[PDB]
Design an enzyme around this catalytic site. Sequence first.
Site, mmCIF file in Angstrom:
data_model
loop_
_atom_site.group_PDB
_atom_site.id
_atom_site.type_symbol
_atom_site.label_atom_id
_atom_site.label_comp_id
_atom_site.label_asym_id
_atom_site.label_seq_id
_atom_site.Cartn_x
_atom_site.Cartn_y
_atom_site.Cartn_z
ATOM 1 N N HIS A 68 -6.763 30.542 -15.629
ATOM 2 C CA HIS A 68 -5.725 30.092 -14.659
ATOM 3 C C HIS A 68 -4.574 31.103 -14.649
ATOM 4 O O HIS A 68 -3.427 30.744 -14.971
ATOM 5 C CB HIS A 68 -5.270 28.658 -14.952
ATOM 6 C CG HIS A 68 -6.302 27.640 -14.616
ATOM 7 N ND1 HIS A 68 -7.048 26.997 -15.579
ATOM 8 C CD2 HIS A 68 -6.748 27.187 -13.422
ATOM 9 C CE1 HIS A 68 -7.886 26.168 -14.995
ATOM 10 N NE2 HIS A 68 -7.717 26.259 -13.679
ATOM 11 N N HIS A 72 -6.904 34.802 -10.733
ATOM 12 C CA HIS A 72 -7.394 33.563 -10.080
ATOM 13 C C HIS A 72 -6.603 33.309 -8.786
ATOM 14 O O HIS A 72 -7.233 33.071 -7.738
ATOM 15 C CB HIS A 72 -7.307 32.385 -11.049
ATOM 16 C CG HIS A 72 -7.676 31.078 -10.434
ATOM 17 N ND1 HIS A 72 -8.970 30.773 -10.103
ATOM 18 C CD2 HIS A 72 -6.927 30.007 -10.096
ATOM 19 C CE1 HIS A 72 -9.013 29.562 -9.593
ATOM 20 N NE2 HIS A 72 -7.770 29.065 -9.588
ATOM 21 N N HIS A 106 -1.156 28.075 -5.876
ATOM 22 C CA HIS A 106 -1.790 26.751 -6.142
ATOM 23 C C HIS A 106 -1.858 26.436 -7.639
ATOM 24 O O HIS A 106 -2.022 25.244 -7.961
ATOM 25 C CB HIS A 106 -3.170 26.626 -5.466
ATOM 26 C CG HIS A 106 -4.313 27.150 -6.275
ATOM 27 N ND1 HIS A 106 -4.600 28.493 -6.350
ATOM 28 C CD2 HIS A 106 -5.229 26.522 -7.037
ATOM 29 C CE1 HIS A 106 -5.640 28.677 -7.135
ATOM 30 N NE2 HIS A 106 -6.051 27.483 -7.568
ATOM 31 N N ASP A 107 -1.766 27.431 -8.525
ATOM 32 C CA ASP A 107 -1.892 27.210 -9.992
ATOM 33 C C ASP A 107 -0.677 27.801 -10.717
ATOM 34 O O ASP A 107 -0.793 28.078 -11.920
ATOM 35 C CB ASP A 107 -3.222 27.765 -10.522
ATOM 36 C CG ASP A 107 -4.366 26.761 -10.487
ATOM 37 O OD1 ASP A 107 -4.090 25.545 -10.594
ATOM 38 O OD2 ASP A 107 -5.534 27.197 -10.360
ATOM 39 N N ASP A 217 -10.920 27.355 -4.419
ATOM 40 C CA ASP A 217 -10.572 27.189 -5.852
ATOM 41 C C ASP A 217 -11.821 27.392 -6.716
ATOM 42 O O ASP A 217 -11.661 27.870 -7.847
ATOM 43 C CB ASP A 217 -9.912 25.839 -6.117
ATOM 44 C CG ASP A 217 -9.201 25.763 -7.454
ATOM 45 O OD1 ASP A 217 -8.853 26.837 -8.008
ATOM 46 O OD2 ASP A 217 -8.990 24.631 -7.934
ATOM 47 N N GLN A 269 -23.310 23.437 -16.633
ATOM 48 C CA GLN A 269 -23.115 24.201 -15.367
ATOM 49 C C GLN A 269 -24.025 23.629 -14.268
ATOM 50 O O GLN A 269 -23.553 23.532 -13.105
ATOM 51 C CB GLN A 269 -23.348 25.697 -15.590
ATOM 52 C CG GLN A 269 -22.177 26.400 -16.262
ATOM 53 C CD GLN A 269 -20.905 26.297 -15.452
ATOM 54 O OE1 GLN A 269 -20.746 26.947 -14.428
ATOM 55 N NE2 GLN A 269 -19.987 25.457 -15.893
HETATM 56 C C1 LIG Z 1 -10.547 24.087 -13.178
HETATM 57 C C2 LIG Z 1 -11.609 23.486 -12.296
HETATM 58 C C3 LIG Z 1 -11.309 23.600 -10.833
HETATM 59 C C4 LIG Z 1 -11.876 22.048 -12.678
HETATM 60 C C5 LIG Z 1 -12.895 24.294 -12.492
HETATM 61 N N1 LIG Z 1 -12.989 25.548 -11.916
HETATM 62 C C6 LIG Z 1 -14.123 26.231 -12.110
HETATM 63 C C7 LIG Z 1 -15.230 25.728 -12.881
HETATM 64 N N2 LIG Z 1 -16.424 26.403 -13.109
HETATM 65 C C8 LIG Z 1 -16.616 27.800 -13.111
HETATM 66 C C9 LIG Z 1 -17.945 28.334 -13.204
HETATM 67 N N3 LIG Z 1 -18.219 29.638 -13.210
HETATM 68 C C10 LIG Z 1 -17.155 30.477 -13.120
HETATM 69 N N4 LIG Z 1 -15.841 30.100 -13.031
HETATM 70 C C11 LIG Z 1 -15.575 28.777 -13.030
HETATM 71 C C12 LIG Z 1 -15.024 24.425 -13.444
HETATM 72 C C13 LIG Z 1 -16.154 23.789 -14.241
HETATM 73 O O1 LIG Z 1 -17.068 24.481 -14.733
HETATM 74 N N5 LIG Z 1 -16.070 22.422 -14.334
HETATM 75 C C14 LIG Z 1 -16.949 21.482 -14.909
HETATM 76 C C15 LIG Z 1 -18.020 21.894 -15.740
HETATM 77 C C16 LIG Z 1 -18.910 20.951 -16.287
HETATM 78 C C17 LIG Z 1 -18.789 19.590 -15.997
HETATM 79 C C18 LIG Z 1 -17.739 19.192 -15.150
HETATM 80 O O2 LIG Z 1 -17.544 17.834 -14.802
HETATM 81 C C19 LIG Z 1 -17.452 17.542 -13.424
HETATM 82 F F1 LIG Z 1 -18.625 18.005 -12.920
HETATM 83 F F2 LIG Z 1 -17.339 16.201 -13.176
HETATM 84 F F3 LIG Z 1 -16.429 18.203 -12.800
HETATM 85 C C20 LIG Z 1 -16.821 20.103 -14.604
HETATM 86 N N6 LIG Z 1 -13.875 23.717 -13.238
HETATM 87 MG MG LIG Z 2 -5.221 23.898 -10.304
HETATM 88 ZN ZN LIG Z 3 -7.161 27.076 -9.280
#
Ligand SMILES: CC(C)(C)c1ncc(Nc2cncnc2)c(C(=O)Nc2cccc(OC(F)(F)F)c2)n1
Ligand SMILES: [Mg+2]
Ligand SMILES: [Zn+2]
Length: 313
Positions: A68, A72, A106-107, A217, A269
């Site tokens: 963050h 980003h 936004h962050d 995002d 993932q």
């Molecule tokens: C900060 C927020 C916006 C929430 C976010 N941003 C990017 C994400 N993945 C990401 C993947 N590859 C590269 N960069 C970023 C994840 C994530 O993996 N969230 C996640 C991972 C596993 C389970 C889960 O629970 C949910 F599915 F209910 F959201 C949420 N969460």
């Molecule tokens: Mg945010």
């Molecule tokens: Zn963000």
Amino acid sequence: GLMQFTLPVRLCKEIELFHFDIGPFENMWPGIFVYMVHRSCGTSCFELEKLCRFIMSVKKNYRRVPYHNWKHAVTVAHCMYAILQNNHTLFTDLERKGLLIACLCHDLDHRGFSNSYLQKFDHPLAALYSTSTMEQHHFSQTVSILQLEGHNIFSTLSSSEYEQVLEIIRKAIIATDLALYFGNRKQLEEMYQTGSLNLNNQSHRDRVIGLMMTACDLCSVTKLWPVTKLTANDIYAEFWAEGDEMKKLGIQPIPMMDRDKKDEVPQGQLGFYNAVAIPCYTTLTQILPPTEPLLKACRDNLSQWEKVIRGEE
Ligand SMILES: CC(C)(C)c1ncc(Nc2cncnc2)c(C(=O)Nc2cccc(OC(F)(F)F)c2)n1
Ligand SMILES: [Mg+2]
Ligand SMILES: [Zn+2]
């Protein structure tokens, strides 16, 4: 007025593509943002002296956290730029102004912890903003910077245009609360399928901007696999730190935030792609068909994680 930002040929061509990576040269990112603002909005949209001073104040107020961070902010602003440029006629002048600034901001002042962690820690911000804690703080930070002397990039808008643009930015930043995404997409799915979706309805525009903000995002899932995989390390770096902080409060964190459970991340993932990412880019492709490369890139990356679990990499 006649001072146009120009990028090197390879960046000039790739910046127009959704899967563009902004690169590891921090000192090029402000110019990359100004470039996108000029082509997306116009060279007249902002006073360059005011815009440049706003950008550097925003940069200063992003922290040195693994995910963050300033990179980003710019990466999300670039996804918005690609959506707006592929959807030329769909958005007003005020929306193209507001949304690029909304994404960059936004962050603002993210400490690398979830709304959930602020609540369980009993952080002052959780007392000030009961729901969408960090996102209300991100908007608060955005207003503060706009009000710094010589930072008001919207000064040439009328009172009502100013109030409209700040309202676009507030809704856009609040919509980056992923807790609010699930209901927003569901409503958008119903509206699309029953054919009641109407872009002249302001409530419907708000929802579509909301979904656009979620898509921007999450755009790290829409990059080439090397970018998506290495960005996934930065995200889990923050999750595991929050996991550590939960254990310190005497709370076992969820497996997603437990560094002792790294083996579970590939499957974690898959759930995230299926539950959040793919649905998001699917609805977005339904409403804005030219955004289809985000859905395609996202599906390619789903397959790459499937390949990780099967031991092929
Ligand atoms: C900060 C927020 C916006 C929430 C976010 N941003 C990017 C994400 N993945 C990401 C993947 N590859 C590269 N960069 C970023 C994840 C994530 O993996 N969230 C996640 C991972 C596993 C389970 C889960 O629970 C949910 F599915 F209910 F959201 C949420 N969460
Ligand atoms: Mg945010
Ligand atoms: Zn963000």
